[PDB]
Amino acid sequence: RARVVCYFSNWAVYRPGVGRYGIEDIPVDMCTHIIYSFIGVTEDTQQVLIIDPELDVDKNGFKNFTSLRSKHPGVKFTVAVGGWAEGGSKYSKMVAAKSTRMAFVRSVVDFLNKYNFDGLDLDWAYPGAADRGGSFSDKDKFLYLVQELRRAFIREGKGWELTAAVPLANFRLMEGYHVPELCQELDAIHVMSYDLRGNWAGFADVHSPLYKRPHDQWAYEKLNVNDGLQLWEDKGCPTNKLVVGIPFYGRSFTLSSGNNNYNLGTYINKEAGGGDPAPYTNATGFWAYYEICTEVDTADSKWTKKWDEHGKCPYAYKGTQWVGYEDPRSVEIKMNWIKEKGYLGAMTWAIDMDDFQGLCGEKNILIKLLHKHMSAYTVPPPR
Ligand SMILES: CC(=O)N[C@@H]1[C@@H](O)[C@H](O[C@@H]2O[C@H](CO)[C@@H](O)[C@H](O)[C@H]2NC(C)=O)[C@@H](CO)O[C@H]1O
Ligand SMILES: *[C@@H]1O[C@H](CO)[C@@H](O)[C@H](O)[C@H]1NC(C)=O
Ligand SMILES: *[C@@H]1O[C@H](CO)[C@@H](O)[C@H](O)[C@H]1NC(C)=O
């Protein structure tokens, strides 16, 4: 009854060489819930925005994805609306009035019917966030959107699920999330327990520490997976609605000039924007798990690998490059911790960044860990 929630990135198909990851690459049997990311919302009409129509519609992306249920009928296939790149202003605008929300709700219902999805994952980052085009009113109005979507899903009579991806920082919760009301309307809360540290913070650190470290101060004090999930509980979310996010990627940094200190919290060249891009994801500031393991785990690697004893995460560095991530050791620790706490399951961002090619050894090694622990686990009643 535990969940293994797999976010699937529709843009991963454009990665060159062995990075190429399409619908056919999804290890469907390792997941209980798979989420096609992303669709968006239009600025002008508050309707569903199809972001890559040539892929999603013309090449039958949406339907290829949902058709996987023929061979795997136990698995739920949903779609996610939003994501970071979509921005927050169009969503704040969409929820501002009852009329615009109902327009979106209708559009959503038509879309889900048309492409045979099992429901919707909400990925607005974030209601109430001034840095994301949000405002104070978003908190009530996001709740209204959620209530209105749930009611529409009920009226359709197909048992569609409604879920949401959420942050764990307290200030974000206060600004955007009516926790008890949201958790009762949603089938699951996909907690984004990653990107907790990164170039934007001005220092090198792992981005999904499980527990507090000594250098964690002020806003960062409780910004860890354990305390963050505890925060969701304290604000009124039942343990059996909480799904814990696991990143299949690392956050990278370029260290400051002449800096020979590689410890957690060391100063960085923030203007660099992060570590140098890797060959497949091609982005400053992060590496896919498979880009990390092919560099760090080879026999003749010049990388130095270390372990965060409190956060329970690996980090590795070479020259000016520093990357914090998750490996099988750290993932295993989180799986056991999930079961100990009694949470609903594990989520990954994102399945397309696992070592699906087995470049480093075993294919799909990280998702195999999630599946192994969750499939043998019974979620206890709410605490
Ligand atoms: C709701 C939310 O904040 N979703 C986050 C993701 O958007 C984000 O992944 C990022 O998605 C972008 C598209 O919206 C991509 O442009 C970007 O490359 C991608 N970044 C990574 C590292 O995959 C992830 C991770 O930052 O957090 C999600 O929960
Ligand atoms: C969908 O499946 C068809 C038939 O195998 C394939 O030709 C097409 O490329 C697939 N589309 C996507 C987006 O994966
Ligand atoms: C890779 O990303 C960089 C950003 O630094 C961009 O300039 C370049 O066009 C990208 N290359 C490919 C082949 O995607």
Author numbering: 24 to 406
Q: What does the article say, verbatim?
A:
The glycosyl hydrolase family 18 (GH18) chitinases (EC 3.2.1.14) are enzymes that hydrolyze chitin, a β-1,4-linked N-­acetylglucosamine (GlcNAc) linear polymer, into chito­oligosaccharides. Among the eight groups of insect chitinases, group I chitinases have been enzymatically well characterized and have been shown to function in a chitin-degradation process that is closely associated with insect moulting. Our previous work reported on the group I insect chitinase OfChtI (previously called OfCht5) from Ostrinia furnacalis, a species of moth that is the most destructive insect affecting corn production. OfChtI is highly active in the hydrolysis of chitooligosaccharides, colloidal chitin and α-chitin, and exhibits kinetic properties that differ from those of bacterial and plant chitinases.
